[PDB]
Design a protein around this ligand. Sequence first.
Ligand code: MET
Ligand code: MET
Ligand code: MET
Ligand code: MET
Ligand code: MET
Ligand code: MET
Ligand code: MET
Ligand code: MET
Ligand code: CA
Ligand code: CA
Ligand code: CA
Ligand code: CA
Ligand code: CA
Ligand code: CA
Ligand code: CA
Ligand code: CA
Ligand code: CA
Lengths: 158, 154, 156, 154, 154, 156, 156, 156
Amino acid sequence: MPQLTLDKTDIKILQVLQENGRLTNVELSERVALSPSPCLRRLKQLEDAGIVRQYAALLSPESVNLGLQAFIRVSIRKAKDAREDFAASVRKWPEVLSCFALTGETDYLLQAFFTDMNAFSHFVLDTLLSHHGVQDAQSSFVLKEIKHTTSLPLNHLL
Amino acid sequence: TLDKTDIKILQVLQENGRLTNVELSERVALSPSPCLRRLKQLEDAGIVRQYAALLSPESVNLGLQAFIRVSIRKAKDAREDFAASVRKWPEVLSCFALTGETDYLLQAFFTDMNAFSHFVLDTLLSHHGVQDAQSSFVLKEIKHTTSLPLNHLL
Amino acid sequence: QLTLDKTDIKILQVLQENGRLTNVELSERVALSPSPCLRRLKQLEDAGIVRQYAALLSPESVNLGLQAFIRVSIRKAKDAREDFAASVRKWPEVLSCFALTGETDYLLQAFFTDMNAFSHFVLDTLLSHHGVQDAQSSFVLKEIKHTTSLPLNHLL
Amino acid sequence: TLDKTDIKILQVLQENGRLTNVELSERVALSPSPCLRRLKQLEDAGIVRQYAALLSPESVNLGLQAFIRVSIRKAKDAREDFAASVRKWPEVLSCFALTGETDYLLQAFFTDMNAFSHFVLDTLLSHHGVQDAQSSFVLKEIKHTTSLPLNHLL
Amino acid sequence: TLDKTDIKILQVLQENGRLTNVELSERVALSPSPCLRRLKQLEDAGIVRQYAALLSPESVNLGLQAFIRVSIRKAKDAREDFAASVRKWPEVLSCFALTGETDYLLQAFFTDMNAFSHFVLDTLLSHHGVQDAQSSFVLKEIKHTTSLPLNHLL
Amino acid sequence: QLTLDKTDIKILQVLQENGRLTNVELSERVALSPSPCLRRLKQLEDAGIVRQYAALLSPESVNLGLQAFIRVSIRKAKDAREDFAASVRKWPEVLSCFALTGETDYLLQAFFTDMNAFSHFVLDTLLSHHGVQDAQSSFVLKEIKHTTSLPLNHLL
Amino acid sequence: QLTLDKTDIKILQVLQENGRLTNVELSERVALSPSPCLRRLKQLEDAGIVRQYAALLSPESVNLGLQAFIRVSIRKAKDAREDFAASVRKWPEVLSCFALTGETDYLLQAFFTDMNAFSHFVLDTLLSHHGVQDAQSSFVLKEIKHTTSLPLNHLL
Amino acid sequence: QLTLDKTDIKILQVLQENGRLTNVELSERVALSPSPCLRRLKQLEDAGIVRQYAALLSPESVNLGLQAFIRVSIRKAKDAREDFAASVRKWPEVLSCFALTGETDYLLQAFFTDMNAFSHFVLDTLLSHHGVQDAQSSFVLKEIKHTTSLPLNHLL
Ligand code: MET
Ligand code: MET
Ligand code: MET
Ligand code: MET
Ligand code: MET
Ligand code: MET
Ligand code: MET
Ligand code: MET
Ligand SMILES: [Ca+2]
Ligand SMILES: [Ca+2]
Ligand SMILES: [Ca+2]
Ligand SMILES: [Ca+2]
Ligand SMILES: [Ca+2]
Ligand SMILES: [Ca+2]
Ligand SMILES: [Ca+2]
Ligand SMILES: [Ca+2]
Ligand SMILES: [Ca+2]
């Protein structure tokens, strides 16, 4: 468990790395009041313990022409492995960044990104709705990004 | 504008953000000094907005990830207040104004359904701007990446 | 059907709340002697009025923290209805099951330890059952009220 | 912390709640005295909330089991007044604050539809904090038990 | 031909279907002789489709009056089979094809909720054509009349 | 709250279908003695069973081509419910009004000449009424069945 | 009123597809001399059948590449209906607008450059209008068919 | 591809409202000599900018007094989409059809003379089509606004 593996300073480590993910061990060492050796040791425990799963470069969709962030609610037909064949193909679609099996009226909620609405129609008509397992889709689109952080809260571990 | 090599840099760094300039230069088929100019251009051009360490919710005890469908009152100071308030809720990671049935969509994280209940009943719904909420929960993470698609730039 | 009296109702009304009372105690509550009281309580059991006595447990005390109310709708065949009802009775994590009016056709009441527990039940058991066409599940955030006790003032 | 015979006792009593100590002990591979202690602890520990006689709705003329979905208007203490009122309504057996479209969900019992109409129109819908109500009725009780699952502790 | 007096007739008979031609001829200001010519021509032109005795549903023990919204499976004949089956169900008084979410709306009467369940569960839902159903019940008759409006004809 | 003789039901069954029948013609459709057939109505109508005898007309024949079913929800202000009731009673075009269970609070069954007639009613009368929060109107495309006759075999 | 024959419906039908045709051409297609064709056409305008001659453009060709249908709900004020009507009429991007039956009270058809533009309109114009309670917007993914042409063969 | 200028748009804006103008009448309005203006317009037609000149009619003048906005759901079988598309294109009472985002997959604009006409269509042609799973129809009570004119100022 994290209270019997992650002490106060490790939590600050993940807090800083979550936000400035490309620091060097020494930059981080300066950031958490620690000698470069044990700091490195700690950041290695966390990476091997599964806590830090990935370091990534986050981009601006608008800058790379992606104007239309769509949240699509999908329902899967009662077929053999409709679930798994949908799941298999959703991982192959680069435009679809995330997919989740949700509670409620919808079975699946997908988070996608596209350039313009024409782009989106060809994907919805020719890929999503054309897929044997996909029974019905409902697409909504983002009008304003009020908030967007990859950072999880860690004060519950304290 | 940016060329096929600038698109290879971004594709690569989206997956391994911490990747070294030697390694990066190698995969993008460029020398160390010149390719490190592109990456600095790109960072200085805003294309790359942040470098982040992505964590595993299970590992840090956030075993409950929710999507909450919220709607604000027909008010002037309801819009900004809810926004200003969601920005200060660390449990709440993203928030969006959607088209369609619901006006706002929140994506947040919790430990247990108990943690959630206190948040929804004592923070969210008691916010003067919030008119109604409707929260669903993630049963199975089929796919989740922070990597944007870049083939359209080719 | 058994013809009930004022004392007969008081007995039920006592038993529903404290169902482990000794007959000596139940007799003194409802203002009766053991012998008569015992014959009543037995007549009330005989009649089918009392269907069972039950020890009621605290869900959180036994690690079930997540209480799901699940709206199910079953496939349209002259078999899915009985198969689903048959399976529902074999599922111990589901306590109640009701065929309802309105949008949802079936309503289930189920208890689980965590949300991950639910995910296995819904994905691997409920929604893979040939009869189940769709599910919509909610969760209890706060128990405002929960009694097992039926009202009996309409009999007086 | 509950062992194998602590759990089985709970299993036995959840079904046959009025057993003698002697016939309870016979059903758990335990002698009277030990079994009486293991039960005492379970009660003092909060595990056994109460012992209740379960009756038949049909038996006592209650032929209409309604599951009602009500929402509450946004006003100071509307939820507390609803809660406190629903606790003094004997026809209402249980009431839960829920995730999803509905704010609340009651399970009520009535002699017939006329009885229901009077409750809904002149007590539920007339309470100040009650904004809306959607009632549905049970057509067939496929399963009903009070007995919680306990095989997760084994 | 539907001049004022022909409407004064229709209006009166809708309310008092049983009225004597003497009394009818009096309320519409006509000698009996032509009042009986006019009415017969209304009876034989189709206008008056039926004279009917309207009964109190509670009086004959049918307390439960339902409104069911039914959708037929989209195949061949199903539409006709559900139609013809609905015509042989005496508890179903009216059945309309409506616009909107639901495809058919049924008005039906029952003795009690138990009588309703048998019907929904063993007839309505078990009919090969019926895809699904959604039943709502009448808590109070605010108004009910068989009299059409006819002012527009004036 | 009772049950009547086998042919006493027929009296109601016959009258519901042919309501302006002569007691002579009635006594011939129920196998009842001539004048004692008038005696039996003298017990039914003279009780509460028969509420009214009415002339049922053809909507199309009197120009009423459009029959709407309107789902109306009511504002929760002080006695807004009786206000609505008080007004639906006065609107001739609205034939029947019921307080339903489910999503919508009230259901109205109305008749109109054409859609323009419905617009004026909906905009200028229904939705402009102080108690009416929302309305949701659906129209009939085809009358599969319509009888004013109740089932009476539950009484045998 | 006018009495339209097969020649006159042919006039309107040709004009509906080809609005700009020369009077000589029009008369050639519709089997009439220029002299009366001209009269008959002007009779259809003066009558009110021809309400407007218009050139219809391709949205994409004018960068308006985002067509939205918007379902709007007016709050219950007294003037809310007319205020919204008035403001709707001044909004050029909103081309048509309808009081519909059903769940939605108003249906709008609008054209925008792209979602950014759409966001500005909903957040800063539509939802900030005092009489507007709610907005549920959808977009066109594929234009299967779109004509201004009405069917007129029911008049024959 | 052609670039549009301040004058070019005026030609667009004027034509959109007054479609049947003569070339002389258009020239003396956009600040262009008759000869240039002639060509420029033909290049806009040829460029796809102006897609069709139409005479627009009054529904109520030609007895089409029921405007239905229909929401259809297509059966997701083997290319049922193309079939519905191909037959929607033949149905004259249907002027427009769109693949929408959100609850419904399709949205139709239809025009009828009355409810009888609508019934005949929805029951015996639309819902009897093999690709059509569900249909949900509404009707306009009031046209607040209707223009064919697109906005063009975003090009200035
Ligand atoms: C494959 S995810 C299933 C979700 C489930 N039916 C629910 O909404 O509760
Ligand atoms: C005919 S395409 C239908 C698209 C679907 N309604 C959506 O929301 O994505
Ligand atoms: C907070 S912005 C809400 C937008 C609205 N849901 C729409 O569909 O237009
Ligand atoms: C009375 S608590 C209401 C909870 C809220 N409707 C939700 O979905 O989270
Ligand atoms: C049985 S006719 C069905 C009509 C369809 N529900 C509509 O609204 O258009
Ligand atoms: C399995 S019984 C289903 C009944 C149906 N949902 C109704 O509303 O009447
Ligand atoms: C106008 S009474 C409304 C009753 C409410 N719709 C219910 O379902 O209980
Ligand atoms: C602004 S008119 C609203 C009409 C309403 N939606 C109905 O169905 O009757
Ligand atoms: Ca909404
Ligand atoms: Ca809890
Ligand atoms: Ca999990
Ligand atoms: Ca809600
Ligand atoms: Ca009743
Ligand atoms: Ca409601
Ligand atoms: Ca487009
Ligand atoms: Ca944007
Ligand atoms: Ca009209």
